[PDB]
């Protein structure tokens, strides 16, 4: 097999000899494919460099208890019509109820906060 | 005993095809007797070799064997005779003990007092045959040819003994195999580079061998493939794979910056979708705290939805940073720009000139498949030079012998009855000579056998099969400039040093300088396509380019005008018509074997018994395994002398 760091496919030999200039056809149409891909690189760098501008500033100017208030219960139900089953969201919104206490409430009331009826509403996204 | 078999190019432990045919007794017989044969052989050779300055008679051989060996003494004799016939013992120059056969048997005309000739002549004379050599030159030795003025001494043909390790061969000198190069301007080549390229050269060659054997790329367009063609193909394929790398890299840069793009998008369309939410939240947060639960929700909802999308964007913002250094790395790991520089491909061109030198032809011409068929048989040992001039050997071999100098053979006539050689005086063309003989040994160079309108007619003509081999195999060229000076201005620790030519087309031109000799002499080799062109370029111009080259390398004022100059023109020399044989594309080494098969004339009267062969060939161009050397000649000679004695004195 070829000495280390020489490259010789059955294929490539047939292909650089198949006529009397396949020789320097093949070398050039790579030379040319090379400049194409360098030009694509400059274009996609300019494009990218614009969006880094649009991102200038970042988003800098843009930032418990187990007794349920009635305030809290109503925040829950509403969170349900707008978060279905995302107990982490519902808990984030209610402010002061672990992700369990949500899941519990979610059953304890279930019947009399029409929670099934609420969730078939949330179906419709 | 067994490293005397090697010193005789024989296996110590097996009998050879030769031995088989002269001793079918022993080799078809029991393994025990073979060992006895092989001992007696190896020992007789050792004995000869231990003191080859004097004849080893059947007598002395028997005296210095022991044990159960001088038991069987027809065997010691049958062997000793076989060795002396095939020129393995009592060859070259030896003090005879039993002086020469009183009166001689058979008459041989040898054409050429080159080494192949002299070697055969001595053998044939030693076997009591009437030998006369016809030489066109005013000297012996042929392509062994030594210039000699004052204490100046320089070989214009053979100057090396490429090994003593089983070589049938006067003051030999090791070659300091350390060779500095010197680009066109005069600048040495950093050892850094010299090594890069020598390795690339070495790899490029193995590459052609692979390209030949494994990939079977030996034809292309009906025409067969030169080492040249293969090397270019390999070098192109290397250039191509430079670019194939260049691409796949600058391409895995784009793929990476179309991930940065796709993401810088998500990250812009979040800045926006987050601006909205933060408005919408400020707004809902106006409606102030004594508020109903549908608007405390609308505040809280937003506040959640907004620290969600703020995390999400920070998550996309470390991703931004990875993809951005990942890219800044690749932007500073460019793969190799080029396969080889220009200064590089120019030093490669010199490593190729060194190849064009040894093989004495353009690589355009060498068989890819077969240029190196002789390679398994290179001798062992230091490659040496002859300090005192190689001429010493032909001359030494010539004394004793009937050599007609200034005798150019014009026609060779061979018939069932015998042969006549028609020759003339080179100093008057007009004066004619007719040598009648039992057999003719032709040691005419392949150059001469090839002369397009013949220098020498064979009557009758050599058969198709012979002339076809002569046409097929290559006869190359390699010339020298002898530079004689008053003072040793080069580095005397250094045997040889290169000059790198500007172009490919000129890699041969005074590409390499040798310091070999007692006197202040430098040899300048012209190889490759150069060798051929420079022959048609005035002596003065050539010595010009030499001094130019030398002044650039050594300092424009350390380099005197030369006392004496010589310049070989071997292709133009009509007794040589070149330097030596090479296996051309579409030849093989089989041709070396055809070149050596002797010719047997048709019968004189029809329906008469099958003749005896008459026309025999030796010379450099007739020995498959040692072409293009002195030893190979020397052997071809000893060989023919055997084949002829086996016929005209019986086997
Ligand atoms: C420049 C050069 C460098 C070489 N370097 C080396 C080296 O370093 N080491 C090495 O081992 N080998 C070397 N060789 C090879 C070596 O010189 C030859 O292989 C060998 O000397 C030739 O042996 P030969 O007897 O076959 O040929 P030749 O010496 O050619 O003998 C043939 C003879 O025939 C004569 N002749 C030609 N036409 C006629 C005619 N019509 N009638 C009569 N006589 C005729 C010629 O003048 C010549 O004497 C070199 C060869 C050359 C040219
Ligand atoms: C260090 O310098 C050396 C340079 C060259 C060889 C060498 C030679 C050769 C050829 C021409 C000359 C001359 N002049 C020479 F001196 C040697 N000729 C041959 N050939 C042998 C095989 C044949 N096909 C062609 C000659 N080879 C292989 C060699 O290695 C050996 C060395 F030691």
Q: How many angstroms separate the Cα of B10 from the Cα of each of B4, B16, B313?
A: 8, 8, 84
| B160 belongs to an annotated ligand binding site | yes
Give the resolution to one decimal, in Å.
2.9
Q: How many angstroms separate the Cα of B75 from the Cα of each of B71, B201, B279?
A: 9, 53, 118
Report whether residue B145 contacts ligand 2, using a CB cutoff of 6 Å.
Answer: no
Q: In whole angstroms, what is the distance from residue A63 CA to residue A83 CA?
A: 22
Cβ pair B91, B636 in contact under 8 A:
no
How was this one solved?
Answer: X-ray
- Of B44, B84, B123, B203, whose CA–CA distance to B637 is shortest? B123
Q: What is the largest CA-CA distance in chain B?
A: 148
Q: Which residue of A has its CA nearest to B234?
A: A8
CA atoms within 13 A on the CB side of B229: 22
In A, which residues are within 8 Å of B306 by CB distance? 62
> Two tokens at B151?
């204490």
Residues just before a chain gap in chain A (C–N exceeding 2.5 Å) are 63
- Of B323, B247, B333, whose CA–CA distance to A40 is shortest? B247
Please give the sequence-ordered ranges of beta strands (E in DSSP) within A20-98, or none if there are none: none
Q: Do A8 and B210 touch (CB under 8 A)?
A: yes
Give Cα B109 distance to the centre of its chain. 33
> Two tokens at B527?
């190889």
Residue holding tokens 């990942």? Answer: B326
Signed CA dihedral, B451, B457, B458, B463: sign only: positive
One-character DSSP codes across B573-626:
-TTTSSS-EE-BTT--THHHHHHHSPB-PPPSSTT-------EEE-SGGG-TTS
Helices within B287-333 (DSSP H only): 293-330
Q: Whose CA is nearest to atom 11 of ligand 1?
A: B629
Q: Which residues contact B608 (CB under 8 A, 6 or more apart)?
A: B416
Q: How many angstroms separate the Cα of A109 from the Cα of each of A106, A114, B193, B436?
A: 6, 8, 85, 135
If one counts every other C-beta atom within 10 angstroms of the C-beta of residue B254, the result is 17
Give the bridge partners for B367, in sequence order. Answer: B226
- Of B412, B403, B440, B405, whose CA–CA distance to B110 is shortest? B440
Q: In whole angstroms, what is the distance from residue B263 CA to residue B255 CA?
A: 13
User: Phi and psi at residue B596, in whole multiples of 5°?
Assistant: -95, -15
Mutate to test the interface with B, among A4, A5, A8 (most CBs of B within 10 A): A8
N-terminal to C-terminal alpha carbon distance within chain A: 62
Q: What's the DSSP call for residue B562? A: P
Report whether residue B359 contacts ligand 2, using a CB cutoff of 6 Å.
Answer: yes
> Two tokens at B6?
């090697």
Residue holding tokens 């004849």? Answer: B55
Q: What is the 3-state secondary structure (H, E, C) of B406-423?
A: CEEEEEEEEECCEEEEEE
Atom of ligand 2 lying closest to residue B359 CA? 25
Q: In whole angstroms, what is the distance from residue B550 CA to residue B349 CA?
A: 20
Cβ pair B89, B83 in contact under 8 A:
yes
Give the bridge partners for B424, in sequence order. Answer: B408, B432
Q: How many angstroms separate the Cα of A11 from the Cα of each of A124, B28, B217, B466?
A: 58, 51, 12, 40
Report whether residue B160 contacts ligand 2, using a CB cutoff of 6 Å.
Answer: yes
**Rg of chain A over all Cα atoms, to the nearest angstrom:** 32
For chain A, which residues make up each domain, given as ranges?
Answer: 1-125
> Two tokens at B487?
């003072």
Cβ pair B68, B36 in contact under 8 A:
yes
One-character DSSP codes across B192-260:
HHHHHHHHHHHHHHHHHHHHHHTS---BSSSSB-BHHHHHHHHHHHHHHHHHHHHHHHHHHHHHHHHHH
Q: Do B203 and A75 touch (CB under 8 A)?
A: no
Report whether residue B172 contacts ligand 2, using a CB cutoff of 6 Å.
Answer: no
What is the crossing angle of helices A10-17 and B227-286, to 10°? 110
Signed CA dihedral, B645, B647, B648, B649: sign only: positive
Q: Is the peptide bond before B396 cis (omega within 30 degrees of 0)?
A: no
Q: In whole angstroms, what is the distance from residue B48 CA to residue B4 CA?
A: 10
Nearest listed ligand to the Cα of residue B422: 1
């Amino acid at each position: 097999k070829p000495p280390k760091g020489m490259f010789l496919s059955q294929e490539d030999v047939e292909a650089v000899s198949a006529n009397a200039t396949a020789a320097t056809t093949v070398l050039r149409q790579l030379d040319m494919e090379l400049v194409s891909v360098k030009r694509q690189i400059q274009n996609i760098k300019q494009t990218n460099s614009a969006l880094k501008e649009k991102l200038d500033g970042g988003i800098e100017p843009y930032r418990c208890n187990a007794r349920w208030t009635t305030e809290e219960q109503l925040l829950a139900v509403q969170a349900i019509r707008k978060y279905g089953r995302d107990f982490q969201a519902i808990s984030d919104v209610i402010g002061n109820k672990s992700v369990v206490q949500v899941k519990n409430f979610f059953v304890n009331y279930r019947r009399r906060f029409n929670i099934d009826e609420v969730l078939q509403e949330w179906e419709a996204e | 005993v067994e490293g005397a078999a090697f010193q005789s190019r024989l296996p110590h432990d097996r009998m050879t095809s030769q031995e088989a045919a002269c001793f079918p007794d022993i080799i078809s017989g029991p393994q025990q007797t073979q060992k006895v044969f092989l001992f007696i052989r190896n020992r007789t050779l050792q004995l000869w070799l231990d003191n080859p300055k004097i004849q080893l008679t059947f007598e002395a051989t028997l005296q210095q064997l022991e044990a159960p060996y001088n038991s069987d003494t027809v065997l010691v004799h049958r062997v000793h005779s076989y060795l002396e016939r095939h020129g393995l013992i009592n060859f070259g120059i030896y003090k005879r003990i039993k002086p020469l056969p009183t009166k001689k048997t058979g008459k041989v005309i040898i054409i050429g007092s080159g080494v192949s000739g002299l070697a055969a002549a001595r053998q044939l004379q030693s076997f009591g045959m009437d030998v006369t050599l016809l030489e066109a030159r005013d000297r012996v030795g042929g392509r062994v040819a030594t210039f000699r003025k004052g204490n100046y001494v320089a070989d214009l043909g053979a100057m090396v003994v490429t090994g003593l390790g089983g070589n049938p061969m006067m003051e030999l000198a090791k070659i300091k195999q350390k060779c500095p190069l010197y680009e066109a301007n005069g600048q040495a080549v950093p050892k850094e580079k010299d090594e890069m390229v020598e390795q690339e050269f070495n790899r490029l060659l193995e590459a052609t061998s692979y390209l030949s054997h494994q990939l079977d790329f030996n034809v292309l367009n009906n025409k067969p493939v030169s080492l040249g063609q293969a090397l270019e193909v390999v070098i192109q394929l290397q250039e191509k794979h430079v670019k194939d790398e260049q691409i796949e890299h600058w391409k895995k840069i784009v793929k990476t910056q179309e991930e940065l793009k796709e993401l810088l998008n998500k990250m812009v369309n979040l800045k926006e979708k987050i601006k909205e939410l933060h408005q919408q939240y400020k707004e809902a947060s106006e409606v102030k705290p004594p508020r109903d639960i549908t608007a405390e929700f609308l505040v809280k909802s937003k506040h959640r939805d907004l620290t969600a999308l703020c995390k999400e964007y920070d998550e996309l913002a470390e991703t931004q940073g990875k993809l951005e250094e990942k890219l800044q790395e690749l932007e500073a790991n460019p793969p190799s720009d080029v396969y080889l520089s220009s200064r590089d491909r120019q030093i490669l061109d010199w490593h190729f000139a060194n190849l064009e030198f040894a093989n004495a032809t353009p690589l355009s011409t060498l068989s890819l498949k077969h240029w190196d068929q002789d390679d398994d048989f290179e001798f062992t040992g230091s490659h040496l030079t002859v300090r005192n001039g190689y001429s010493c050997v032909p001359v030494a071999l010539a004394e004793g012998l009937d050599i007609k100098l200034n005798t150019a053979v014009r026609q060779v006539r061979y018939t069932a009855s015998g042969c006549e050689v028609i020759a003339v005086n080179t100093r008057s063309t007009s004066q004619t000579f007719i040598y009648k003989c039992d057999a003719v040994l032709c040691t005419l160079p392949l150059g001469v056998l090839k002369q397009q309108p013949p220098a020498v007619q064979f009557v009758p003509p050599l058969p198709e099969w012979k002339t076809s081999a002569v046409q097929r195999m290559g006869f190359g060229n390699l010339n020298k400039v002898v530079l004689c000076f008053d003072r040793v201005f080069w580095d005397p620790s250094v045997n040889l040093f290169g000059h790198v030519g500007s172009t490919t087309a000129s890699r041969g031109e005074l590409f390499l300088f040798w310091n070999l000799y007692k006197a202040p002499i430098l040899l300048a080799l012209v190889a490759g396509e150069a060798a051929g062109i420079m022959e048609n370029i005035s002596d003065d111009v050539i010595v010009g380019r030499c001094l130019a080259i030398l002044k650039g390398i050594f300092g424009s004022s350390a380099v005197p005008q030369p006392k004496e100059t010589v310049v070989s023109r071997w292709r133009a020399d009509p007794w040589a018509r070149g330097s030596y044989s090479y296996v051309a594309a579409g030849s093989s080494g089989n041709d070396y074997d055809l070149m050596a098969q002797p010719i047997t004339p048709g019968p004189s009267i029809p329906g008469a018994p099958q003749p005896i062969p008459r026309l025999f060939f030796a010379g450099e161009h007739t020995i498959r395994n040692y072409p293009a050397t002195v030893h190979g000649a020397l052997l071809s000679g000893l060989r023919e002398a055997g084949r002829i004695a086996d016929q005209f004195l019986g086997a």
